[PDB]
């Protein structure tokens, strides 16, 4: 099951640290795709350590990619956060 993860923590991923977001209130840790992306490194780690909801779906995405974010999530933002 999901940990939960309180945005203290993920704000100290955004860095080679590690890259993590929030997509959906749920949390992500994408430090390696930071290579493979499209997006670059950089335009993940601009949005990295919390909230990138609205940036993942102003651009917008593939189900493909929807399915991918399933094995780059952690679990969620916790609810004592939210
Ligand atoms: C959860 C991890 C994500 C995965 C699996 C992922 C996957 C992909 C894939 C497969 C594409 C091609 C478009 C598609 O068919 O969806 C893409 C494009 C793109 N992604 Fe992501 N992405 C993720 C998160 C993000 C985030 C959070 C951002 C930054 C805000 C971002 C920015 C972009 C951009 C800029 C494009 C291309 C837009 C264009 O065509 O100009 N992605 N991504």
């Given at each position: 099951a999901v940990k939960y993860y309180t945005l203290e923590e993920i704000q100290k991923h955004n860095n080679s640290k590690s890259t993590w977001l929030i997509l959906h209130y749920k949390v992500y840790d994408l430090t390696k795709f930071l290579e493979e992306?499209?997006?670059?490194e950089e335009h993940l780690r601009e949005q990295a350590?919390?909230?990138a909801t609205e940036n993942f779906e102003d651009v917008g995405h593939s189900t493909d990619a929807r399915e991918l974010s399933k094995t780059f999530i952690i679990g969620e933002l916790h609810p004592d956060d939210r």
């Open positions: 992306h499209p997006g670059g350590g919390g909230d």
